[PDB]
Amino acid sequence: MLTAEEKAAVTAFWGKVKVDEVGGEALGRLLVVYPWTQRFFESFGDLSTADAVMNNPKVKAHGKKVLDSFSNGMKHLDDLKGTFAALSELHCDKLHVDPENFKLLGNVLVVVLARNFGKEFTPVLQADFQKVVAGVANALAHRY
Amino acid sequence: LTAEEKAAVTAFWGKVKVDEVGGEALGRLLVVYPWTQRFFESFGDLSTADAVMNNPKVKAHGKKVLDSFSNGMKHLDDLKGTFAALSELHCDKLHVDPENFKLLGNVLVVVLARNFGKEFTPVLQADFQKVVAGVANALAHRY
Amino acid sequence: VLSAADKGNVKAAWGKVGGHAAEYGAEALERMFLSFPTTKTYFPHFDLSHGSAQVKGHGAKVAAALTKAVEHLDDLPGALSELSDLHAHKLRVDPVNFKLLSHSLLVTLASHLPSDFTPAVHASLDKFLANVSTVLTSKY
Amino acid sequence: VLSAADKGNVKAAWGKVGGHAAEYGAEALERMFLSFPTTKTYFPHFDLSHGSAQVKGHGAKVAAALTKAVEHLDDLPGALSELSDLHAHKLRVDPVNFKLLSHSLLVTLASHLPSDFTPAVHASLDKFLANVSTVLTSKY
Ligand code: HEM
Numbered sequence A: 001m002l003t004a005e006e007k008a009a010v011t012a013f014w015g016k017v018k019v020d021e022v023g024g025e026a027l028g029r030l031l032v033v034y035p036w037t038q039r040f041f042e043s044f045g046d047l048s049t050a051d052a053v054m055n056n057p058k059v060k061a062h063g064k065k066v067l068d069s070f071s072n073g074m075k076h077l078d079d080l081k082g083t084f085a086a087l088s089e090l091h092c093d094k095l096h097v098d099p100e101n102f103k104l105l106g107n108v109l110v111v112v113l114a115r116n117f118g119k120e121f122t123p124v125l126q127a128d129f130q131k132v133v134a135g136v137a138n139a140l141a142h143r144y
Numbered sequence B: 001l002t003a004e005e006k007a008a009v010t011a012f013w014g015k016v017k018v019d020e021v022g023g024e025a026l027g028r029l030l031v032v033y034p035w036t037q038r039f040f041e042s043f044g045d046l047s048t049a050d051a052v053m054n055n056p057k058v059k060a061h062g063k064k065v066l067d068s069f070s071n072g073m074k075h076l077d078d079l080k081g082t083f084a085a086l087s088e089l090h091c092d093k094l095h096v097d098p099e100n101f102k103l104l105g106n107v108l109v110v111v112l113a114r115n116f117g118k119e120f121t122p123v124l125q126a127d128f129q130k131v132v133a134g135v136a137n138a139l140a141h142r143y
Numbered sequence C, D: 001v002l003s004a005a006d007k008g009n010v011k012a013a014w015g016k017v018g019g020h021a022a023e024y025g026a027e028a029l030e031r032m033f034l035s036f037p038t039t040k041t042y043f044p045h046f047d048l049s050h051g052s053a054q055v056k057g058h059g060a061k062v063a064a065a066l067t068k069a070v071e072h073l074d075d076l077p078g079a080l081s082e083l084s085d086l087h088a089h090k091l092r093v094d095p096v097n098f099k100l101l102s103h104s105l106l107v108t109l110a111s112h113l114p115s116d117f118t119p120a121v122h123a124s125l126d127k128f129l130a131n132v133s134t135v136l137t138s139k140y
């Protein structure tokens, strides 16, 4: 769990930053950096090159929904398990995603925040976001 | 585990030698995954495979580890509660990365296979994989 | 990147396996599918029930590839080139699954070769299977 | 093994890092220690406070090793032989921790080189750091 000071820091940062392209970038980078993850996204069409992945409209659209889910998590940090229970079932029982991949996407998201937000994404603030993405990954893995 | 699965693992576990299997599992962890030796500096000579496997402190510690597993086997509906104290020790005091809990569980499964052969069936092994995953998750909880 | 000692242990262990390699491959697959049911989703066209001729047949193929690896420990990338393309490019097998099969193979070997499966041999076989896994995922 | 394209990307990225390598090494260590506090237990002899001389100095050493790796991409095992023995045999570093430092390095590079840190470059640097990590844990 985050301390009060940490929760305040992540909340203030998340408030100010423009994040409507962050999810798409994170999913795209997941698919490029960890190519086995493409197995799960066959219906999204052309993922054959890095440029195809990053310019794929379905990748961008899906990434936005994924980050919307993360943003929902950020509003319920006291009960991530409850927040992600239904999504946990979907990812385990229906989609067959190994939970190691939840940690990978969380870490990619952190890299994307660093790339987009420069000096304000300090070592202290990043450490706070590492707690959040670990919390989300643990909640998504719970039903496994 | 289901009640019928719990019964199956309980009957099999009845057969396990408490004096030997734990020592073998810990010894194999230290040989196969040598970074784990970092946590056992005080145990003396771990410099070779034969030294590890014949080290009395490894055998003695392995017996305690298996005793803990045996305790887990009697509380399969509340592994979290059962392993709370050990979780504090391993996480807060020893700083063991939780990936290593999975490794030791899997080594134990290999040791059960080596010791019990055809009786350690694919079905029974699958049940024990659930148990050792449960134990690892319970030990990791304080992270 | 296996050491001389590891290569020695792997060749000797696989010699002891001998004509049982295909049987042990089938058992390892069965153990993987039962212990780790998610792995079944790579084989949607298979009957994966006990005694399936598809599991038997696939286990034989996996074992034959491991035999080829044991005979070419100095050049696993070349020997397994076709298999690397299949697993990484075509099938997009998640790297975690190689650890699950490798564990399943060690359980199987320990079961059948209890006198031969010493701590040192266990360590060598673990490294061997990790090396094979690394090659089959080398496109990643 | 790194592809020719990956090697190109790694050399170009490290060129852009240029004179900042030691600074970025120190920042990556700080990010590792703050994000993943278990890693601090390898450095009980350090003052781990922000800006400490030991963290700055160690960051410079890590950066120097990465520079040596970038200059010897065709033979990382030879170039990093001494470091492999240190990390695996003497220090017994848990392999998990290499992923934590590697992530910390990618966060640092993305932070400072946002225009240069493309998806393809990210992928190449990830593979580079994994390869360095594999060499330093090669005794395992
Ligand atoms: C923190 C991590 C993750 C979160 C929060 C998350 C969240 C979501 C959400 C919210 C959806 C449904 C979006 C909708 O309304 O349509 C979804 C679908 C999906 N997720 Fe995830 N996800 C995560 C990680 C992953 C990973 C790592 C993979 C695979 C490597 C994955 C694969 C999928 C797939 C395949 C779908 C269905 C896509 C389709 O409609 O065809 N997820 N995820």
Ligand code: HEM
Pocket (backbone or CB within 6 Å): B036, B039, B040, B042, B064, B065, B068, B069, B086, B089, B090, B094, B096, B100, B101, B104, B105, B135, B136, B139
């Ligand atoms: C399922 C996994 C594990 C179980 C059930 C287990 C169980 C135990 C138990 C019962 C003790 C005795 C504590 C006491 O007497 O108060 C102990 C101590 C210890 N365990 Fe584990 N353990 C596990 C995994 C690990 C792993 C993976 C490591 C290291 C890689 C580790 C390192 C230690 C150490 C260093 C001690 C203290 C030894 C000493 O100096 O006396 N354990 N463990």
Ligand code: HEM
Pocket (backbone or CB within 6 Å): C039, C042, C043, C061, C062, C065, C066, C083, C086, C087, C091, C093, C097, C098, C101, C132, C133, C136
């Ligand atoms: C030591 C590791 C492995 C070896 C040596 C191995 C070997 C093989 C071989 C020899 C084939 C048949 C090639 C052909 O007929 O063209 C094959 C196919 C296949 N392998 Fe593997 N494999 C390994 C790991 C895995 C893992 C971990 C998975 C998934 C969990 C997997 C899934 C498959 C699938 C789905 C096929 C195609 C089956 C079909 O549809 O006919 N393999 N493997």
Ligand code: HEM
Pocket (backbone or CB within 6 Å): D039, D042, D043, D061, D062, D065, D066, D083, D086, D087, D091, D093, D097, D098, D101, D129, D132, D133, D136
């Ligand atoms: C890319 C990965 C890494 C590189 C390039 C690297 C590089 C180095 C270098 C150059 C040294 C100094 C060697 C000398 O003075 O002769 C060193 C020492 C050390 N490294 Fe690493 N390292 C890496 C990963 C790690 C990780 C993951 C850990 C632990 C979390 C770690 C812990 C240490 C420790 C404890 C020392 C000894 C410090 C001392 O003597 O004061 N290293 N490393």
